[PDB]
Amino acid sequence: GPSVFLFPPKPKDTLMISRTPEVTCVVVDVSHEDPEVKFNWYVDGVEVHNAKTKPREEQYNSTYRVVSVLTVLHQDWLNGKEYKCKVSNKALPAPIEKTISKAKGQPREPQVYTLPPSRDELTKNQVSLTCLVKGFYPSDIAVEWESNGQPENNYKTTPPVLYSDGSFFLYSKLTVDKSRWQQGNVFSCSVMHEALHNHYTQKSLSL
């Protein structure tokens, strides 16, 4: 009956000390007559006792969805500690365990290139600015466009794709009106990854 789902922190969260990276253990499909769900958290095998279990919430399909949220230290996540959520409930034969961590393997620093649009992309009102980020590991990364300090709206990012040698690459596309690229605005592609200095770099682009 009950299914357990264990979610990692957001990459922008693990990479900036101002933010609060958290692991979330989500139990769904808990019957009405065995609703008491117990949680235990282990960090690299030692039980931790500081997780905040939000009070159960009855779903419209007549099952309880219960959530528990453990906060993690940024150096704990990035040093490769394993997080074991252990969910016990009297609807279960025996308790369910789920574990989560950063990806094993040595970090690799992404190279960041910014490509300008094709000449064939001038006969349009809109134009595509491209940012290639390649050779990074593990694949937790964050890509963001801006110009003149303010963020950009119209950008899309592919998912991280596996190259032959084990590392990852992706592309981010910023659609801008040809006018602004003509005028000469500078657009910037900002990349946040653990293997970067200050965890952040930025590449700029203009006519």
Add this chain to the structure above:
Amino acid sequence: GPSVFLFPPKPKDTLMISRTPEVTCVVVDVSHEDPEVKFNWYVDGVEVHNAKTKPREEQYNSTYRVVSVLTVLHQDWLNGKEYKCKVSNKALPAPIEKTISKAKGQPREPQVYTLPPSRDELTKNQVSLTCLVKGFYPSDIAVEWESNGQPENNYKTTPPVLDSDGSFFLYSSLYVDKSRWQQGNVFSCSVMHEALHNHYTQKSLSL
């Protein structure tokens, strides 16, 4: 299980008359006891007669996989016919079903731009040729690289991404030795998609 998955034909196959496009019904996790799975196959409400059930496979999860494949007309699939696979096995409460067809909607043709390498990237031994394919619908597409008629090995393609307007885009990345880029070789990105004239377009790139 018995849990049913239904897959569509590969794109390349539905776009050339020479290849054979098949829809593929996969029953993961059949039990050793009562392993007799059955299949039936509806095309737009007409039972068809020519399916090829692959005998068995047996997994290291002491359970079985039972694939049936059904071959399809190229115009049948491109015209949006529904392909109904129905699975009868006594271990199931009642017959399972699944359906598949092409994404509904007006096919939109891809725009194909090729981007040269970044100036930054030329201080390396290897170099990334990029190919942006954008504006296409439905998202079944094929992308390949070639030079002097002969194919390329070292290219990877991102899966297709949804833009705000309902079309898709992707990038292909070919990794070549900076020496070949300078000798002046001509590299070609070849796109195969059902909205293109002759289902095929091709863009070229050189120093």
